[PDB]
Design an enzyme around this catalytic site. Structure first.
Site, PDB file in Angstrom:
ATOM      1  N   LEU A   1      25.612  19.488 -93.388  1.00 18.66           N
ATOM      2  CA  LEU A   1      26.660  18.780 -92.672  1.00 18.66           C
ATOM      3  C   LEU A   1      26.203  18.460 -91.256  1.00 18.66           C
ATOM      4  CD1 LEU A   1      30.077  20.272 -93.787  1.00 18.66           C
ATOM      5  CD2 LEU A   1      28.351  19.019 -95.066  1.00 18.66           C
ATOM      6  N   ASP A   2      27.068  17.769 -90.526  1.00 17.51           N
ATOM      7  CA  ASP A   2      26.803  17.381 -89.152  1.00 17.51           C
ATOM      8  C   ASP A   2      27.777  18.071 -88.208  1.00 17.51           C
ATOM      9  OD1 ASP A   2      26.229  13.870 -90.087  1.00 17.51           O
ATOM     10  OD2 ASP A   2      25.254  15.743 -90.687  1.00 17.51           O
ATOM     11  N   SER A   3      27.344  18.196 -86.954  1.00 12.63           N
ATOM     12  CA  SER A   3      28.195  18.783 -85.927  1.00 12.63           C
ATOM     13  C   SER A   3      29.511  18.026 -85.804  1.00 12.63           C
ATOM     14  CB  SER A   3      27.453  18.797 -84.593  1.00 12.63           C
ATOM     15  OG  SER A   3      26.840  17.544 -84.339  1.00 12.63           O
TER      16      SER A   3
ATOM     17  N   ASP B   1      31.094  16.514 -88.214  1.00 13.31           N
ATOM     18  CA  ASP B   1      31.921  16.927 -89.341  1.00 13.31           C
ATOM     19  C   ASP B   1      32.517  18.306 -89.099  1.00 13.31           C
ATOM     20  OD1 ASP B   1      29.518  15.137 -90.742  1.00 13.31           O
ATOM     21  OD2 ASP B   1      31.487  14.806 -91.651  1.00 13.31           O
ATOM     22  N   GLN B   2      31.697  19.248 -88.634  1.00 11.38           N
ATOM     23  CA  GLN B   2      32.195  20.596 -88.378  1.00 11.38           C
ATOM     24  C   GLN B   2      33.321  20.584 -87.353  1.00 11.38           C
ATOM     25  OE1 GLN B   2      31.696  22.660 -85.425  1.00 11.38           O
ATOM     26  NE2 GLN B   2      32.870  24.290 -86.422  1.00 11.38           N
TER      27      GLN B   2
END
Ligand SMILES: CCCCCCCCCCCCCCCCCC(=O)OC[C@H](COP(=O)([O-])OCC(O)COP(=O)([O-])OC[C@@H](COC(=O)CCCCCCCCCCCCCCCCC)OC(=O)CCCCCCCCCCCCCCCCC)OC(=O)CCCCCCCCCCCCCCCCC
Ligand SMILES: CCCCCCCCCCCCCCCCCC(=O)OC[C@H](COP(=O)(O)OCCN)OC(=O)CCCCCCCCCCCCCCCCC
Lengths: 176, 51, 125, 459, 606, 88, 168
Positions: free
Chosen positions: F42-44, F46-47
């Protein structure tokens, strides 16, 4: 609000925080969640555009222009979260959030009732003095003479024994 | 016994008695103008001895 | 756009002196951190110190009170603008109020001597 | 009057010889009996003032002070019964004896006619106060504080005495109401002006203006509960009573011998009320509030109007009681903590649920919440000052506002925040201190109810 | 003539009784809230009788219960003046307070110190009834300041809500700034007429008598909400909704206007006050309506609306329709309270989210409160027959029918529009758009203690206005001769507000991205007036109290001057007179100088 | 009008509900320890959006200090539990 | 309750004209009140007054004989000065209470006249202005240390001024 931060920061966290702030202010500007999703996706694209870039020059330039645009196009009266600062519940219950040590000065005619709970306080405090001195050497042994420390706290490297400095965290009253 | 302890409670009453007596002695002095004033000058009705 | 002020300071982010990447400045930050952590740890070795029957002493608080209360006259050195502000605060306003009151009273007095000022109902004074 | 004094002169040997386990209770209860008997003076059926001899007398302006003193004695006793608990029986007996000597002197002076007797008693008030302050304080500057106290007072004392002599010689006698029935008027020259000065300067130096308010905070801070009580309650009132009783002769001088003192009093009221905002030390805040109110008292005393005198007496009594009460509360919060600072202990009212309502009921009486003798006095005095000039409501209002401010600041930095977590030494309220608060309060209620007693000469 | 005073004292005795119970030990056994609610109900049923006897006789009454003192030709005594104003205000206030007490008994469960809350409420109520039915300006000051302190406590009931303390401090400061002018009036009257009573003051109906009027004017601006001293009304909202309604919808603000109207006899012969009552009250119908267009908090919006209505009433006073103003107070109270009641129900149902921005579909999810809220909104707009009309429209007649200043009239009508504007704002953002609130739901409004009060208050807000407008004696002479475009102006302009609010709220959609425009930012931030005042005035005043007074006068100069100067002086003189060394060769020379001096002095003086 | 408190089963079911309604990368099958950046790539962004959605779902706010460090649904749940003091 | 002191003007009560087909509530309301409340209260009052009358007691009114005035009072001597000054304080207090009486009667008249206070409530205002000119010319600028001597100085200065005016 339990763990503490580092002194310096990094471009990473700076950009993350700008992102979250802007998205909250956008949720506030554009009420309907559909419009919020729309403009949030737009902001995500704006970011992913320059994401892969790594040159500190462009980084600082874009960040300091972004903060100015943000401060100049932010919401005057933003959306505060009640249970957090600015809201209408922050500390609302602190007038009822008494600590425990008020207990000791009870009268025996009162702690007569509620007997069971006071049957367990002792074996809790007993769980404190029996394992206090040890919690000191764990640091005074690992108080690295280098003398460059943070506010973090190491656990009980042994088993059975308890960690250091658990009193000011455990027993912290509920939120209600 | 106990009087050495529970006698002290006799002073203050005795002090008040002595005070009223001393004020009575003072007022018995200054007896002049007993009835010679010009706003309470009576006739000394019979059997009514002086103030 | 935006300008600073004595009230609305330049917020954290916008501050040009922030976003700096100086190793010396970051080292100063980390030194501040070492300091603050030593302080908090010395404080937590007492907040939870069992067998305690008392409270904590705040020497910063005590020193602040000392400096606001009693360390003043010794370290005080008279100079101008200071003597000046003092004489001002001690003389000026008293005398202004005084001229005001004296003028008012003289007005009232001459008015009455003339026999004009409507004093009806001023029975209690 | 001996009926009030002699027993107060018997409490002393009583204290000396009584056993430790019982001296406290015995002397306390008997002092309360004295307070009770001290009400005979209130049988003032008709206007003919009371005169007991050539050496004593009473009056509507003095009786209140007498009762208030005979009733503040036992409160000093009680509030002085948890500290000096590890001090020897002989020492605490000395303390009691000094308190009682203060009581007796104050009674004899507030009763006496001859201003020279008044003066010797007004100056004998010192020794017990200086002692109480030096030998029982809790800091080191108490020494300088006592020195300032003593020497301010004596500097005042001297020219007062010299003028009393000039009078006793020019006039035949010094007895009051004779000074009245044989007063006269003065050519109004520099001689009589300096005489006016030498007569009022001491009473003023005692009842502090802006210029000489300096010995009050040091005293009320370095000194213990009893010294603070008695200062804030009576040892100021002595100056006011003397000025009232003596100004009867100096007519007309006090029309133009007042402007500087009125100006100073008002400006000082304002500046001190302001400092009460940013003064950390709680007892210092209280002391400066006392200054702010005694300035009103003085401004009302000078101009010599009946409304003004009645307001002065009302506010006098009210402030006496209220300041004693606030100082009890401060001491209370101190014995548990041992730090006067206001910002250290915070966010109470979660463990002292009741005490607050003894904090609150004081502030409301400081900021002139009615129906209270406090506001009645403030208001009648503001009326007199408005008549004397239309441009003083300004200062009255500024003071009222700044008071309404700092009273609540004090309430809110000690009973409105969130509780600390390292004050494990919070021994709950003692029935004794709760009793002291209730006793300082209740009389305010009864007097708010029936104040005709507490009016003054003109009523 | 005995039943009347009996009732008028019985109501106060009833309100006392609980407080007395508070002292006792029964509370831990007894349902204090229900006890107090029912005592209040019977107090209202009592207060009703005066209304019947008064409409059937129109006989005012004046009483002197207790003689307090006799201060040398200026006496004092507990005097009541049961006339139209107070004999009606008691009934209205009780009709509201009974419902409020039920609402609280339901809304403040899970809280321990509820009996404490109830006692505080009824104490404020006693003080307000005193202020209302009092005659002696002293009794009136009593009511004034007691109301102030009660409001302080109630805003602070949660003594950890830091900003609540500051809000209370704001309130006290402004109320004291009003008390200034009030004491001014008391003093001027006690001097120029020797009495404090309205009876013996009415005889000031001939002189300039302008300073006391300025004093009462500042008192109004303070205790009510006006231009200079409004900012304390919006912050109180930090406190609970029941009190944010009672103390800030029909009480603690109407007090100033009540005072002015009781003093109206002297305001008809002062053509300056008649004017300044327009450049002060009509203005507030703008400097708050503006702030009542973007504010998100329900309670803040309602408070700004209240300030608007109070300014409107001060305007009608300025132009001399005081009985109209009073009737409007009465009516206004009903629905301005029901709105806060519904809002409190909404909030407690949700997780403490005042913000409109996170609520919707309220009609479907909760029909009752929405119906009542619409009732109140339209009544405040000025719907033709909902007890709003019967005062608002006569007022809007007079405002254009009399010789009223142009700008004042104009901004007043603009405000009459902005009423409908922000009312439909509430409607749309809360009751017509989508459910933008969280997923979880635990709604419950089928509880009687919360469903009955609103019902009673709605019946009242629909009937009492009409009832009163047709039953009261016709105090003044109206004006019923004008064109339609001046008789129906309020109606037309409120309909305009409806249309405009609909258009704009529907424009909120369409993906028309927003932009931080300065007019709207100003409106939201109140106009920056607090943002500058509360940030400079404190700073400068405190910095002066520290620099000049504390340090530079009370610790530096008044010590360096008298005591330390004496110290240095005597110290130096002693250094001199004991710098002496033990040498006779010198002591004798000195003796010789002295002998010479004495001989010479005698020689000169013979 | 207070509803009942929150328990661990409810919290977990809700969190899975939300992270499943998520569409970017989640293959509709999340292990309680389905690490975002590591175990799901995932990506920052998204988090952070996940953290924000959770904030909106539970009313309160999660501070940045811990939002940046949360990398496990189990950790999110432990955090919520130590914040609301659940499971007496 | 000296009615010659407190007038209590007459009470021109109106009459009832209940022209309708509905009953007056006040009728039944006040009937039930006067029934249930006044009955026990009145019986208790009679009981109390009977006990009073059986154990009656009287008390008189103190009549202060008169004395010489400040005028016929040699300076330096005091006894006379005191027996005059206290009489004067009595007179001062009585005049103050007279002022109170006037003000009370005035407020009564005002309310009892209602809105017509400007026409029928003007008689008493004249007594007030007159009495107040008197109280002014007597006790205006004395000082809290007021007394017969200062009042006499006031009177004398005023007489001298009036007499100078008359002579020119
Ligand atoms: C005159 C007109 C002016 C009216 C304006 C009044 C302002 C109101 C100020 C105020 O609220 O005072 C706080 C006070 C209550 O404070 P509180 O913190 O809510 O008391 C709770 C106790 O801590 C805990 O409750 P409690 O168990 O102690 O209750 C029993 C009661 C027992 O009181 C007694 O029995 C003492 C009897 C003497 O004790 C008290 O409540 C406090 C006394 O108000 C009162 O109820 C006292 C009577 C109010 C009438 C006016 C009293 C003078 C002011
Ligand atoms: C000098 C005082 C300052 C010193 C403070 C220390 C005080 C200790 C000494 C003892 C206590 C002080 C004595 C106070 C006396 C109380 C007077 C009183 O009870 O009020 C009397 C009142 C009757 O009212 P009254 O003012 O007399 O006449 C007007 C017509 N109603 O009747 C009442 O209604 C009273 C109400 C009681 C409840």
């Amino acid at each position: 609000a339990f763990c503490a931060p580092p002194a310096y920061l990094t471009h990473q966290q700076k950009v993350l925080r700008l992102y979250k702030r802007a998205l909250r202010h956008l949720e506030s500007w554009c009420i309907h969640r559909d419009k919020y999703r729309y403009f949030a996706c737009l902001m995500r694209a704006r970011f992913e555009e320059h994401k892969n870039e790594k040159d500190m020059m462009r980084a600082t330039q874009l960040l300091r222009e972004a903060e100015e645009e943000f401060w100049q196009n932010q919401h005057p009266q933003p959306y505060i979260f009640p249970d957090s600062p600015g809201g209408t519940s922050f500390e609302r219950y602190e007038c009822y959030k008494v600590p425990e040590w008020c207990l000791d000065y009870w009268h025996p005619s009162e702690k007569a009732m509620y007997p069971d709970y006071f049957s367990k306080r002792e074996q809790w405090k007993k769980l404190r003095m029996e394992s206090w001195d040890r919690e000191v050497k764990q640091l005074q042994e690992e108080t690295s003479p280098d003398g460059i420390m943070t506010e973090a706290l190491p656990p009980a490297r042994r088993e059975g024994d308890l960690p250091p400095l658990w009193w000011h965290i455990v027993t912290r009253p509920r939120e209600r | 016994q106990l009087l050495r302890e529970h006698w002290v409670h006799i002073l203050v009453p005795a002090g008040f008695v002595f005070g009223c007596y001393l004020d009575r002695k003072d007022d018995e002095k200054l007896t002049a103008f007993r009835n010679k004033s010009m706003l309470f000058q009576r006739e000394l009705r019979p059997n009514e001895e002086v103030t | 756009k935006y300008k600073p002020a004595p009230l609305a300071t330049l917020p954290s982010t916008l501050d040009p002196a922030e976003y700096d990447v100086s190793p010396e400045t970051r080292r100063a930050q980390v030194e501040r951190l070492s300091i603050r952590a030593r302080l908090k740890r010395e404080y937590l070795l007492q907040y939870n110190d069992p067998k305690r029957v008392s409270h904590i002493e705040d020497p910063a608080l005590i020193r602040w009170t000392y400096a606001r209360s009693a360390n003043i006259y010794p370290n005080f050195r008279p100079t101008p603008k200071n003597s000046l502000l003092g004489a001002v605060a001690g003389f000026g306003p008293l005398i202004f109020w005084y001229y005001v009151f004296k003028t008012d009273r003289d007005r009232k007095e001459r008015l009455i001597q003339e026999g004009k000022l409507d004093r009806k109902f001023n029975i209690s004074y | 009057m001996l009926k009030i004094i002699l027993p107060s002169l018997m409490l002393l040997p009583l204290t000396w010889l009584s056993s430790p386990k019982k001296t406290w209770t015995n002397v306390t209860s008997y002092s309360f009996l004295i307070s009770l008997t001290s009400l005979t003076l209130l049988w003032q059926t008709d206007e003919n003032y009371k005169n007991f001899s050539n050496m004593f007398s009473s009056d509507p302006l003095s009786t209140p002070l007498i009762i208030l003193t005979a009733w503040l004695l036992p409160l000093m006793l009680m509030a002085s019964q948890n500290h000096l608990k590890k001090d020897n029986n002989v020492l605490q007996k000395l303390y009691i004896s000094m308190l009682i000597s203060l009581q007796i002197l104050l009674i004899m002076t507030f009763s006496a006619t001859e201003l020279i007797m008044f003066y010797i008693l007004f100056e004998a008030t010192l020794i017990p106060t200086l002692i109480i302050i030096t030998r029982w304080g809790n800091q080191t500057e108490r020494l300088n504080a006592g020195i300032y106290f003593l020497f301010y007072t004596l500097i005042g004392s001297i020219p007062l005495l010299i003028a009393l002599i000039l009078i006793q010689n020019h006039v035949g006698t010094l007895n009051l109401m004779i000074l009245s029935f044989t007063t006269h008027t003065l050519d109004a020259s520099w001689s009589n002006n300096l005489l006016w000065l030498a007569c009022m300067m001491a009473f003023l130096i005692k009842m502090p203006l802006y210029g000489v308010h300096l010995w009050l905070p040091k005293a009320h801070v370095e000194a213990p509960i009893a010294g603070s009580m008695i200062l804030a309650a009576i040892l100021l009132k002595l100056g006011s009573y003397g000025m009232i009783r003596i100004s009867i002769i100096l007519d007309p001088l006090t029309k133009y011998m007042a402007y500087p003192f009125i100006l100073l009093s008002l400006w000082g009221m304002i500046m001190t009320s302001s400092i009460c905002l940013r003064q950390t030390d709680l007892k210092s805040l209280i002391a400066y509030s006392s200054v702010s109110h005694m300035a009103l008292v003085i401004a009302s005393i000078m101009i010599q109007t009946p409304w003004s005198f009645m307001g002065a007496t009302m506010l006098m009594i009210a402030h006496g009681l209220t300041s004693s009460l606030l100082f009890c509360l401060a001491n209370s919060n101190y014995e548990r903590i041992h730090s006067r600072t206001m910002i250290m202990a915070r966010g109470l009212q979660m463990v002292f649920p009741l005490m607050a309502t003894w904090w609150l009921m004081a502030s409301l009486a400081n900021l002139a919440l009615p129906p209270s003798i406090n506001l009645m006095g403030e208001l009648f005095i503001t009326m007199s000052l408005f008549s004397w000039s239309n441009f003083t409501i300004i200062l009255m209002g500024i003071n009222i506002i700044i008071t309404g401010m700092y009273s609540m600041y004090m309430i809110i930095t000690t009973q409105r925040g969130k509780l600390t977590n390292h004050m494990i030494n919070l021994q709950p309220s003692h029935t004794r201190e709760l009793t002291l608060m209730a006793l300082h309060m209740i009389p305010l209620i009864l007097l708010t109810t029936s104040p005709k007693l507490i009016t003054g000469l003109t009523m | 003539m005995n039943i009347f005073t009996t009732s008028i004292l019985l109501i106060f005795i009833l309100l006392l009784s609980p407080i007395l119970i508070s002292m006792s030990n029964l509370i831990k056994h007894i349902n204090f809230p229900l006890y107090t609610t029912t005592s209040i109900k019977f107090s209202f049923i009592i207060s009703l009788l005066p209304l019947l006897m008064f409409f059937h006789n129109n006989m005012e009454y004046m009483i002197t219960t207790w003689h307090w003192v006799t201060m040398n030709s200026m006496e004092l005594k507990m005097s009541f003046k049961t006339d139209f104003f107070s004999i009606l205000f008691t009934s209205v206030a009780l009709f509201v307070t009974w419902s409020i007490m039920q609402f609280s008994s339901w809304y403040m469960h899970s809280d321990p110190n509820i009996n404490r809350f109830i006692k505080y409420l009824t104490l404020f109520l006693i003080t307000m009834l005193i202020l209302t039915s009092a005659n002696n300006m002293f009794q009136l000051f009593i009511g004034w300041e007691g109301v102030g302190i009660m409001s302080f406590l109630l805003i602070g009931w949660w003594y950890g809500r830091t900003d609540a303390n500051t809000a209370a401090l704001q309130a006290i400061l402004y109320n004291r700034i009003g008390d200034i002018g009030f004491i001014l009036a008391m003093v001027w009257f006690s001097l120029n007429m020797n009495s404090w009573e309205l009876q013996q003051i009415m005889f000031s109906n001939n002189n300039d008598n302008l300073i006391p009027l300025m004093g009462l004017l500042i008192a109004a601006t303070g205790k009510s909400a006006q231009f200079g001293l409004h900012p304390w009304l919006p912050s109180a909202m930090e406190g609970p909704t029941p009190v944010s309604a009672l103390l800030h919808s029909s009480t603690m603000v109407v007090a100033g206007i009540f005072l002015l109207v009781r003093f109206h006899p002297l305001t008809t012969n002062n053509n300056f006050i008649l004017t300044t009552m327009l450049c002060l009250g009509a203005l507030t119908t703008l400097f708050t309506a503006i702030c009542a267009l973007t504010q998100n908090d329900i309670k803040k919006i309602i408070a700004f609306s209240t300030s608007s209505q109070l300014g409107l009433m001060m305007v009608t006073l300025g132009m001399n329709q005081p009985h109209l103003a009073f009737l409007h107070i009465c009516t206004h109270a009903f629905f301005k309270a029901m709105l806060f009641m519904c809002s409190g129900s909404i909030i407690h149902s949700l997780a403490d989210e005042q913000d409109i921005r996170k609520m919707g579909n309220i009609t479907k999810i909760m029909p009752f409160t929405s119906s009542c809220l619409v009732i109140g909104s339209l009544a405040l707009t000025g719907m033709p027959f909902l007890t709003g009309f019967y005062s608002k429209d006569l007022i809007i007649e007079a405002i254009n029918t009399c010789n009223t200043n142009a700008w004042a009239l104009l901004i007043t009508l603009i405000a009459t529009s902005m009423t409908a504007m922000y009312s439909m704002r509430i409607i749309y953002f809360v009751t017509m758009t989508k459910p933008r609130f969280p997923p979880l739901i635990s709604i419950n409004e089928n509880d009687p203690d919360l469903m009955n009060p609103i019902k009673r208050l709605a019946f009242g807000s629909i009937f009492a206005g009409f009832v009163i407008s047709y039953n009261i004696p016709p105090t003044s002479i109206p004006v019923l001769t004008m064109p339609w475009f001046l008789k129906t102006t309020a109606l037309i302009i409120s309909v305009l507000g409806f249309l405009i609010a609909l258009e704009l709220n529907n424009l909120t959609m369409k993906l028309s991205m927003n932009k931080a425009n300065p007019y709207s930012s100003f409106s939201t931030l109140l106009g920056f007036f607090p943002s500058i005042i509360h940030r400079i005035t404190p700073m400068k005043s405190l910095n002066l109290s520290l620099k000049t007074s504390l340090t530079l006068l009370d610790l530096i100069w008044l010590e360096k001057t008298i005591p330390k100067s004496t110290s240095t002086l005597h110290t130096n003189m002693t250094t001199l007179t004991t710098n002496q060394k033990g040498l006779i060769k010198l002591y004798f020379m000195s003796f010789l100088i002295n002998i010479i001096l004495i001989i010479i002095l005698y020689s000169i003086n013979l | 009008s207070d509803a009942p408190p929150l328990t661990l089963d409810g919290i977990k079911d809700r969190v899975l509900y939300v992270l499943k309604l998520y569409d970017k990368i989640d293959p509709e099958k999340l292990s309680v320890n389905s690490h975002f950046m590591k175990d799901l790539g995932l990506d920052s962004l998204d988090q952070v959006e996940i953290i924000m959605a959770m904030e909106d779902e539970f009313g309160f706010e999660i501070p940045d200090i811990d939002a940046e460090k949360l990398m496990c649904p189990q950790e999110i749940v432990d955090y919520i539990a130590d914040k609301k003091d659940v499971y007496e | 309750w000296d009615k010659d002191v407190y007038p209590e003007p007459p009470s021109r009560t109106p009459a009832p004209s209940p022209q309708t087909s509905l009953p007056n509530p006040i009728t039944y309301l006040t009937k039930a009140y006067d029934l249930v409340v006044d009955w026990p209260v009145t019986l208790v009052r009679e009981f109390i007054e009977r006990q009073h009358a059986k154990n009656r007691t009287y008390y008189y009114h103190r009549q202060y004989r008169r004395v010489p005035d400040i005028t016929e009072c040699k300076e330096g001597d005091v006894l006379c000065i005191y027996e005059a000054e206290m009489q004067w304080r009595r007179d001062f207090k009585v005049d103050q209470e007279i002022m109170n009486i006037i003000q009370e009667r005035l407020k009564a008249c005002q309310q009892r006249e209602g809105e017509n206070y400007q026409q029928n409530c003007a008689k008493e205002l004249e007594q007030f202005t007159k009495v107040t000119k008197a109280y002014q010319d007597r006790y205006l600028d004395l000082g809290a240390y007021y007394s017969a001597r200062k009042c006499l100085a006031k009177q004398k200065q005023r007489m001298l001024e009036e007499r100078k005016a008359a002579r020119q």
